[PDB]
Scaffold this active site. Structure first.
Site, mmCIF file in Angstrom:
data_model
loop_
_atom_site.group_PDB
_atom_site.id
_atom_site.type_symbol
_atom_site.label_atom_id
_atom_site.label_comp_id
_atom_site.label_asym_id
_atom_site.label_seq_id
_atom_site.Cartn_x
_atom_site.Cartn_y
_atom_site.Cartn_z
ATOM 1 N N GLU A 259 0.984 -1.150 0.012
ATOM 2 C CA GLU A 259 -0.124 0.073 -0.067
ATOM 3 C C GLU A 259 0.950 1.085 -0.121
ATOM 4 O OE1 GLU A 259 -3.791 0.464 0.242
ATOM 5 O OE2 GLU A 259 -2.480 2.008 -0.750
ATOM 6 N N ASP B 119 -2.300 -5.069 0.826
ATOM 7 C CA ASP B 119 -1.422 -3.957 1.555
ATOM 8 C C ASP B 119 -0.107 -4.230 1.925
ATOM 9 O OD1 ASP B 119 -3.589 -2.215 1.361
ATOM 10 O OD2 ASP B 119 -4.481 -3.385 2.857
ATOM 11 N N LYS C 80 -14.867 -7.148 2.378
ATOM 12 C CA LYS C 80 -13.373 -7.397 2.004
ATOM 13 C C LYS C 80 -13.424 -8.651 1.578
ATOM 14 C CE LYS C 80 -10.627 -4.130 2.974
ATOM 15 N NZ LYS C 80 -10.248 -3.096 2.093
HETATM 16 MN MN LIG Z 1 -6.550 -2.023 2.756
HETATM 17 MN MN LIG Z 2 -4.548 -1.505 -0.158
#
Ligand SMILES: [Mn+2]
Ligand SMILES: [Mn+2]
Length: 178
Positions: free
Chosen positions: A61, A89, A115
């Site tokens: 990320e 991430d 998610k």
């Molecule tokens: Mn995330």
């Molecule tokens: Mn992400």
């Protein structure tokens, strides 16, 4: 809210957030709650990567998209791990898995499901934090030591406290969409 963001997050985080918004044609001076939420997510991702021993995590990320995928595809080649359909991430070199981190203004369980679904990958681990000390991880495996988690949860709680002190919390709290 603009001022609160610029006061409470490191300038590297604010620059990345501004960039992520303008890449979707959003103006951080107007969509100020999305601005805060991006900054918070980045902050937690960075805190989380510091939580291990050093060298435990690779940060994905916060990178431009070409670098991010370069890291991702390099790791998949090195380690044999299944390549994700979308950028996660972090990579955890101790557990050999990608991690997807979420920070929810709603409830962790619903966010986790969204998610699980938004990615739907057998492979990627998911860890969700709320601003009120809740947390929900894949197979209740929370990855970091409890002290590390507690520092994250404490930071999120302090952010929420600081917003509510400026009367920003109600609007922010209500700004996340399903
Ligand atoms: Mn995330
Ligand atoms: Mn992400």
């Amino acid at each position: 809210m603009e001022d609160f963001v610029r006061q409470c997050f490191n300038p590297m985080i604010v620059e990345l957030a501004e960039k992520a918004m303008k890449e979707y044609g959003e103006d951080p001076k107007i969509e100020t709650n999305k601005f805060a939420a991006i900054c918070t997510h980045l902050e937690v991702c960075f805190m989380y990567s510091d939580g291990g021993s050093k060298h435990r995590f690779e940060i994905i990320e916060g990178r431009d998209r070409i670098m991010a995928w370069t890291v991702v595809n390099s790791i998949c080649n090195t380690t044999g791990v299944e390549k994700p359909k979308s950028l996660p991430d972090l990579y955890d070199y101790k557990e050999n898995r990608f991690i997807e981190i979420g920070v929810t203004r709603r409830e962790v369980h619903i966010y986790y499901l969204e998610k699980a679904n938004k990615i739907k990958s057998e492979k990627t681990h998911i860890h969700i934090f709320s601003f009120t000390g809740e947390e929900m991880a894949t197979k209740a495996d929370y990855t970091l030591d409890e002290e590390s988690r507690a520092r994250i949860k404490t930071r999120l709680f302090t952010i929420r406290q600081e917003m509510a002190s400026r009367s920003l919390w109600d609007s922010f709290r209500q700004s996340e969409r399903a």
